[PDB]
């Protein structure tokens, strides 16, 4: 037994030495976003938003217990989706646009069918294979989904059957965030262990683990390339990892920031790294300078969600002030 | 504004009149979070007053035409610091503690500190259902375990003046129970900035009047938050 821990420590030392040996531009400017829309109607805490693939439609999950589908141009309630578990912590929009997935404190991930022949948005499948609260759900294709839960597990599900094609069980804490890759072949997560992990979706095994943080991890999103991602943490810093380098790149913190990040979303070109924070406001970091490119200070409570269109036109933020602002430039 | 777009700004308004219907329901029903431990008895608390792999267990009950939630956090994991944030903007936190096992009493005190000093649970008042007081009563009536083993400061501690013993109560058990309650009020008075107070309570498994206690407590939190909003307090 003791020799086992000795060998494990030796292997960890080898990993650290390999990573250490492996390691070896005009500013964006003050970006301002004059809230071209302001999307009110949520009755309670907002926790999650996800863009549609058309850069127009948008769903937001709020902890009243209702998903709301809005038209980002004319600010209309396209659909109204009541739920059964009010404690929603994630939401997703399927690329086809037919389905949306929401998950929260209850261990289930419910699949909601938009483009139905009878008219009303209705359920498609309930996924019930967990023992901890679900914190991030993402549609792979129309018939596949990936969910990260409270118990130390990520998963890949077959929506038609309703069973995990593969379970991912390498973590040691509550998995908070989850980001499918551009090619839908990989995904990364942060799991309240200061340990972000990369996974393979077909073989069913964790490929890499990154340990830059010094506290929990709250949000994660792939770079639009698919060879990197960033993690948000309660230690008041964001970090940038590279998959192939298997290391840390940058940390996103300044001495005036005391509170932790809760929602990270990249830019479509990846140059702007928006980040939600506890201190009632967002920030935009130029993800290659780690500087404060600007502040989306428009909220009266903790930002909780953040996302950027597939066209790069706009970005939407929602704090628990029950408002989901939509932001864009000018001129 | 085209004919199809004119109907796009119309169904949006019929959904407005549905979200302005649920706002009345949402703000006319108060939420509560229940917290505790393995032998605390919150399961027995629910089983007593609810009747009058699921992540969260709901509970419905109303007293005097006011509807109350109570979210018992069930088949979750040992850690607590990421699903406890979801219970901000809640009316109160009920925190059942078993004070008849001094080994876990200090752990319950640590949990109370964590709830009380939490950054998001700083505007959230707590209803402490100090549970199963009778077990703590025989824990000292047939005195075999010395409380001063884990509590040397109990030696030079006397019954508080404002104590109101139940009829037919030995003074020593009064000393012990008010002692533990005082340990649970010390954290309360230590910090909080008056925006949220702690509400001690002497509860057991068969305490059949808990609902009024949550009712009165919640009325007190809302009265005091308005009275501070009016700078009257």
């Amino acid at each position, epitope marked *: 037994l003791d020799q086992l821990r000795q060998e494990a420590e030796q292997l960890k030392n080898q990993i650290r030495d390999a990573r250490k040996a492996c390691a070896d531009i005009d500013p964006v400017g003050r970006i301002q976003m004059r809230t071209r829309r302001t999307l009110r109607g949520h009755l309670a805490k907002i926790y999650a938003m996800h863009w549609g693939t058309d850069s127009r439609l948008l769903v937001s999950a709020s902890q009243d217990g209702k998903l709301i589908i809005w038209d980002s141009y004319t600010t209309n309630k396209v659909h109204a989706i009541p739920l059964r578990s009010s404690w929603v912590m994630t939401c997703a929009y399927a690329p086809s646009g037919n389905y949306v997935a929401c998950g929260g404190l209850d261990n289930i991930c419910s699949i909601y069918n938009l483009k139905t022949r009878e008219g009303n948005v209705r359920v498609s499948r309930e996924l019930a294979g967990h023992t901890g609260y679900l914190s991030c759900c993402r549609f792979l294709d129309d018939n596949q989904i990936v969910t990260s839960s409270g118990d130390t597990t990520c998963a890949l599900w077959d929506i038609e059957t309703g069973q995990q094609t593969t379970t991912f069980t390498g973590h040691t804490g509550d998995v908070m965030s989850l980001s499918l890759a551009p090619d839908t072949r990989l995904f990364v997560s942060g799991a309240c262990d200061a340990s972000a992990k990369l996974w393979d979706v077909r073989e069913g095994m964790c490929r890499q683990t990154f340990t830059g943080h010094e506290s929990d991890i709250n949000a994660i999103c792939f770079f639009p390339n698919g060879n990197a991602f960033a993690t948000g943490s309660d230690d008041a810093t964001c970090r940038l990892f590279d998959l192939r380098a298997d290391q840390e790149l940058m940390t996103y913190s300044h001495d005036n920031i005391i509170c932790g990040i809760t929602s990270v979303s990249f830019s479509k070109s990846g140059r702007l790294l928006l980040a939600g924070y506890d201190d009632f406001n967002c920030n935009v970091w130029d993800a290659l300078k780690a500087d404060r490119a600007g502040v989306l200070a428009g909220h009266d409570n903790r930002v909780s969600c953040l996302g950027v269109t597939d066209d790069g036109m706009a970005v939407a933020t929602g704090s628990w002030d029950s408002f989901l602002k939509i932001w864009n430039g000018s001129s | 504004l085209s004919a199809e777009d004119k109907a796009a700004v119309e169904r949006s308004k019929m959904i407005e009149k549905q979200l302005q219907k649920d706002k009345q329901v949402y703000r006319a029903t108060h939420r509560l979070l229940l917290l505790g431990a393995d032998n605390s008895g919150k399961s027995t608390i629910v089983k007593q007053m609810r009747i009058y792999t699921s992540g969260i267990f709901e509970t419905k009950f109303q007293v005097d035409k006011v509807n109350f939630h109570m979210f018992d956090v069930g088949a979750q994991r040992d*850690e607590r610091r990421k699903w406890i944030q979801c219970f901000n903007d809640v009316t109160a936190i009920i925190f059942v503690v078993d004070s008849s096992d001094y080994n876990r009493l200090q752990e319950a005190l640590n949990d109370f500190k*964590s709830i009380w000093n939490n950054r998001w649970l700083r505007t959230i008042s707590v209803i402490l259902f100090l549970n199963k007081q009778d077990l703590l009563a025989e824990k000292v009536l047939a005195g075999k375990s010395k409380i001063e083993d884990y509590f040397p400061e109990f030696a030079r501690y006397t019954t508080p003046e404002d104590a109101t013993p139940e009829p037919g109560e030995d003074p020593r058990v009064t000393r012990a129970k008010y002692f533990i309650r005082d340990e649970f009020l010390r954290i309360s008075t230590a910090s909080g900035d008056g925006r949220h107070y702690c509400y001690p309570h002497f509860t057991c498994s068969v305490d059949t009047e808990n609902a009024r206690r949550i009712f009165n407590d919640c009325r007190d939190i809302i009265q005091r938050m308005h009275l501070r909003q009016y700078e009257l307090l």
Partner: nanobody, 123 residues
């Protein structure tokens, strides 16, 4: 990385050390938590970032003097009169969130921020 245990007779003296690196010791509300064999995991001592607030569990109220050296990044727990029923592996619990006065889960069965431990046995 807890270290510094060994044999001791009833009423002896010892010192417990906790070498910390990688997580900015000087910011977190460190702890000391104890798991005696056959018994669960229960906290003993506590210290804030500046060494101002201190807490004991009563069973350790008169003897064990906690200290903390933020300069050398090490957490200490002084032993003075170890009684025979205080034998265990001494873990070194660290607080979850920086810049906070709340420590939620430092006594969890599987907690991320915690040393390997130090077995301390008293005859």
């Amino acid at each position: 990385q807890e270290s510094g245990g060994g044999l001791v007779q009833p009423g002896g003296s010892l010192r417990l050390s906790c070498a910390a690196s990688g997580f900015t010791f000087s910011n977190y509300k460190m702890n000391w938590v104890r798991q005696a064999p056959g018994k669960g995991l229960e906290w003993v001592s506590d210290i804030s970032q500046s060494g101002a607030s201190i807490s004991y569990t009563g069973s350790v109220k008169g003897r064990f003097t906690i200290s903390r050296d933020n300069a050398k990044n090490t957490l200490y727990l002084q032993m003075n009169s170890l009684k025979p029923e205080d034998t265990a592996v001494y873990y070194c619990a660290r607080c979850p969130a920086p810049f906070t006065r709340d420590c939620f889960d430092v006594t969890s069965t599987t907690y991320a921020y915690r040393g390997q431990g130090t077995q301390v046995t008293v005859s």
